[PDB]
Amino acid sequence: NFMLTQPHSVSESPGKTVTISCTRSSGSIASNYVQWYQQRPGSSPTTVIYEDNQRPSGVPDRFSGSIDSSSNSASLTISGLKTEDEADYYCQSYDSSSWVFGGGTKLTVLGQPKAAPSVTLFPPSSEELQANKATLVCLISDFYPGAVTVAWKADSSPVKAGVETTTPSKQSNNKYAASSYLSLTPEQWKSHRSYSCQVTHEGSTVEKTVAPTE
């Protein structure tokens, strides 16, 4: 009956305060109570907030929750940010019949300056096209925090069929890297004016475009 949408990512410094929103797509957010779960890499999830704003035993008072009726949204707030708070956070609610989870929000506790991603985009090689295949290669590097969103475009129109995207990975220099691949047939590549790779990081978008006319 509904969805819960959270930001892909949020970040702040040790000691500062940060907030994660969770917006209900349909019906009032106050119709059904919200839970918030913490999940660390490897680890299974842990309740941090239940019943909109209640804390399970052993959850520090740094963690709290609230409801915003005007925006039909729930929110998790973490003050006195500490490096160990770094994790994925999922809001959760109920349909009266089915459990609904939010998309997830990667929380980064900053340890170095924010860093915009460098984007390099390559068109199909002449050699690959000769083989009746076609692959657009978008290489993303040097971005911190390690959270990006990648969108592909044929002209203006979004593309999701034939898109393969990795999760970010730590580079040798402690920043992150990722890559995304678009698979086309030579004709699909030949019959559009251009294709674009769109990398959203911390709100702003970085973009690169290639065209079959060089």
Next chain:
Amino acid sequence: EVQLVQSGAEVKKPGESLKISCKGSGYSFTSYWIGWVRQMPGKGLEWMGIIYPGDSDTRYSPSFQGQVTISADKSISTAYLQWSSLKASDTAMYYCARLGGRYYYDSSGYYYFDYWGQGTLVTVSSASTKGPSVFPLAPGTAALGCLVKDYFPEPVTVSWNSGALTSGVHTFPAVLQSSGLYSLSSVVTVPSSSLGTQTYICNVNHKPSNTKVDKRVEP
């Protein structure tokens, strides 16, 4: 003293059947709903279904109905999730969790998942060993690289000019595709002036398939 202990990791193949388990200790297993939750690689938590072990009352999320089979054996406090015919897209982590989460005002109702299993990673692949296919990626400073495409399994080694060239080399972690095969890219950043007077060759080695390719990358 509550514990949900799930069965071990699964290495399986498409078309095969699978049945994983979750065993509850430290509480009345027939007195609580047990839920199943999926989490695919690098993605979020999706609720699959729920069962009351007391009488096998079962309900499925609409996005899973008839796709999977949930059951329980109360005598041994054990809940099961089960596929009759796996797809590689079934590759995920799977948790069981107890519906033990209560709100104070309601002494009958139960609303959220409080205790979670440790998780059971399920890996499914119909891919057999295969050598990569390599393609050149042509160019104050310039960028060139190699597309190493459609191979299995990891790892694959990439060097440039037989190892002589290390500076500016960035070999990207491989993407795992829905076909079951991997691909990666290696990129080296070099001064544009050198483009006309220096040869650049990527060297790809893949031991499991004994594939050895050298690609010249040209302007």
